[PDB]
């Protein structure tokens, strides 16, 4: 299958940010590194955790491989590298279950690229529509549609 | 009052520079850290072995952004769109204030020849390298976007 490109890694990194002490992501999930919330050994990120640049790099790479596998195994239609990057970013933010259950994936796997691109935009909620999620879904949709 | 870099320009610059927390050689022998930082705000040059935190990289990036915004605001005598200001700030961040001020790009720009300056973006691709080509093309396209 495919792997995330430098473009997709940079998109994800830019929207996740990088921090080396654990912080609450706003919805109550403690986060560290570049958006890490679960360490590769299954341990949850908790308040007071600290990490080094190399450790954040390792956690980011592990989770990238995980969501790359999710996308490669869930999507049954051809993808450009742009679309794969966008879908990996989305799934990184929303999770594998949310992707697999989304109408986005239903439309995508019916071959309805435009419908899936537009379905990117419905994932802007904090449980509140946050603006950062709005901008992120818009940027991901734009990458997904870029040829 | 002049312009400041917008989220679009910040995203462009950060995306092409990347962010790193150990000092690295940028390929031409200039040690670099954070988001393209090579000179700390107190004048100290980035040197091999230096480390920084995300917050420190952010502070250094903001300082250098303000510096190059001034260079652009004080060097360009023609009206600019926000797109053009962002593109020029990205370019000047990469090449420096002296190179910009002496460039034929700026001469054409300040004569009111926007198209010529946009095209002059493309000659700043040398140590001729490819990432620089892609960056100059993205900056030129932003510069021409309405």
Numbering used by the authors:
A (entry chain A): 37 to 163, 165 to 184
B (entry chain B): 36 to 162, 166 to 184
From the primary publication:
As a proof-of-concept, five peptidoglycan hydrolases from the Acinetobacter baumannii proteome (PHAb7-PHAb11) were identified using PlyF307 lysin-derived peptide as a template. To understand the catalytic mechanism and thermal stability of these peptidoglycan hydrolases, we attempted to decipher their structures and eventually obtained the crystal structures of PHAb8, PHAb10, and PHAb11 by X-ray crystallography. Despite their lower amino acid sequence similarity, PHAb8, PHAb10, and PHAb11 superimposed well with T4 lysozyme, especially in their Glu-Asp-Thr catalytic triad regions, suggesting that PHAb8, PHAb10, and PHAb11 may be phage-originated. All these observations together indicated that PHAb8, PHAb10, and PHAb11 were highly evolutionarily related to T4 lysozyme and might share similar catalytic mechanisms of action.
